[PDB]
Each structure stands twice: as structure tokens, then as C-alpha cells.
Design a protein around this ligand. Structure first.
Ligand SMILES: *C(=O)N1C[C@H](NOS(=O)(=O)O)CC[C@H]1C(=O)NC1CCNCC1
Length: 261
């Protein structure tokens, strides 16, 4: 009751639309707020694309080592790693790390292409039991985040359940699950989001995202000190097309739902 009041208050103060799903694996409980509404995933969709590559790699031992050309024609609007490798190759492992840890959009496009495109990433989600996730577009257009548009969306509940499966459950084989967790724990982009609302000592693997309409997102697996892990999804979007990001709202949401733990 208190936690719900606090999230509603945060949403009202923020001026936007907030979606939260926490799974506490200590007691199999959840805290949900707009958790069945759709939100544009933006760069948080990179987790599903990397996971689809990892799944493919379970039957293809040379896949992660496969060399992918980086051409000028591959550049899109946010390319911090790929721009340093133009006219050379990167491995699919290197592209996965760049997508997850630096949120490189070229890297995301190569992951998408090498599993068969957005509909293939979506079919992977369906195979895991996630009916909600939909990846419709490639980078950079998947980040438009127009209100009412279902393209490139999921719900907080669906993404929390799927992230649990990927990182703590059995969607991926032992090697592949460990690799995803390693990659997410090495994320460099998330300190202002969920992590900013948790104690300094807690360990986090997360993936942020942002896009049109001031969309500001984070999805995380969290290891609190001496406690079972948590899964937290915080999605946020705003009414104005050119709204600025609100990473503080995600931090505030994280603090609200973990207070006590
Ligand atoms: C993901 O949401 N992206 C790519 C990159 N991610 O930053 S983080 O917040 O994921 O670490 C920057 C924001 C976002 C993105 O691609 N935004 C678009 C860039 C190209 N023009 C439209 C916005």
C-alpha cells in the first residue's frame, strides 16, 4: 500500500508515465506499477538481441568468433565503438559487448541482422514464453517512442519475467547465461539510473535506454548484500516529443521498491 502510494506520487511529480516491475527471488514476490502497459524499450531491447545471438551460439561454436565487417554504410547515429573499427571487422562477441556495455547502435544492428532480423528476435522471445515483447524495427528508428505506438514495445511485467529467465533461469545454457550476466555486470552506462537508487555496495547488471518523448529506461539484475537477487524494470516516458531524459525518476523508483531490502 505504502509502496504503491509512493510510486503514484513519483509518477505524478514526474509529469510522465511510469512502469515498474520488481521480482524478489527471496520470496517469489513482485511489486508492479502499470506493469501490463506497453512502453518503448529503446536500447533495453539490446539484451534480447544479445540473448538471441547467445542462444544461436549454443549449436554454433564458431558464432561468437565470426568476423563482421564495419562499413561506413553501417554507421547510424550513436556508434562509439563501431566508429573506431570502420573498414575492419569485429567479432560477434565484441559486437555483443559493445551493444550491452556502451550501447553502440551499429553493434545492435549487427546482432539483429545475424539472427535474422527483428522478427527473429521476436520469435526468440516467443520461444521463451514471452508473448508481449515485440521488436519491429532496427536502429536507429526503433527509438521513436511515439505515444500509442506499439512498435518496439514490451511491458514491465514481461521484461522482468524474461530478464529473470535469461540471467537467473534456464533460457540459456550455463556458459551463455554466465556470458550474458558478465556482459551486463560490465555495463558502463547505468550509474545514473537504477544503480543511483540502490546502496553503493549492491552489485548490478543492467541495460539502460532512452528515446523520443523523453523516454528513459533501465532493466537490471541486482544482488543486494547477503540477499537473494532481484530483477527490476523501470520504464518511463513523457508527453512532450522533445522532453529531456529523467534518469532521476528511475533512481527514485528503484529506491522506493527496494527500501527495506
Ligand atoms: C538506446 O536507448 N539508445 C542508444 C544509446 N543508449 O544510451 S543508453 O541510455 O542506452 O546507454 C543512446 C540513446 C538511445 C538512442 O539510440 N537514441 C537515438 C540516437 C539516434 N537518434 C534518435 C535517438
Amino acid at each position: 500500500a505504502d509502496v504503491q502510494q509512493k510510486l503514484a506520487e513519483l509518477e505524478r511529480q514526474s509529469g510522465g508515465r511510469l512502469g515498474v516491475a520488481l521480482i524478489n527471488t527471496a520470496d517469489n514476490s513482485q511489486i508492479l506499477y502499470r506493469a501490463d502497459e506497453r512502453f518503448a524499450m529503446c536500447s533495453t531491447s539490446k539484451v534480447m538481441a544479445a540473448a538471441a545471438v547467445l542462444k544461436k551460439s549454443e549449436s554454433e561454436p564458431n558464432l561468437l568468433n565470426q568476423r563482421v565487417e564495419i562499413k561506413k554504410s553501417d554507421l547510424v547515429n550513436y556508434n562509439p565503438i563501431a566508429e573506431k573499427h570502420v573498414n575492419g571487422t569485429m567479432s560477434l562477441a565484441e559486437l555483443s559487448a559493445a551493444a550491452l556495455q556502451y550501447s553502440d547502435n551499429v553493434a545492435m544492428n549487427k546482432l539483429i541482422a545475424h539472427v535474422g532480423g527483428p522478427a527473429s528476435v521476436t520469435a526468440f522471445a516467443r520461444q521463451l514464453g514471452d508473448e508481449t515483447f515485440r521488436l519491429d524495427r532496427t536502429e536507429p528508428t526503433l527509438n521513436t517512442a511515439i505515444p500509442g505506438d506499439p512498435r518496439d514495445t514490451t511491458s514491465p511485467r514481461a521484461m522482468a519475467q524474461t530478464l529473470r529467465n535469461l540471467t537467473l533461469g534456464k533460457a540459456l545454457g550455463d556458459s551463455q547465461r554466465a556470458q550474458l550476466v558478465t556482459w551486463m555486470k560490465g555495463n558502463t552506462t547505468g550509474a545514473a539510473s537504477i544503480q543511483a537508487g540502490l546502496p553503493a555496495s549492491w552489485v548490478v547488471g543492467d541495460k539502460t535506454g532512452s528515446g523520443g518523448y523523453g523516454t528513459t529506461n533501465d532493466i537490471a539484475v541486482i544482488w543486494p548484500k547477503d540477499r537473494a537477487p532481484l530483477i527490476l524494470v523501470t520504464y518511463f516516458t513523457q508527453p512532450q516529443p522533445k522532453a529531456e531524459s529523467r534518469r532521476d525518476v528511475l533512481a527514485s523508483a528503484a529506491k522506493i521498491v527496494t527500501d527495506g531490502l
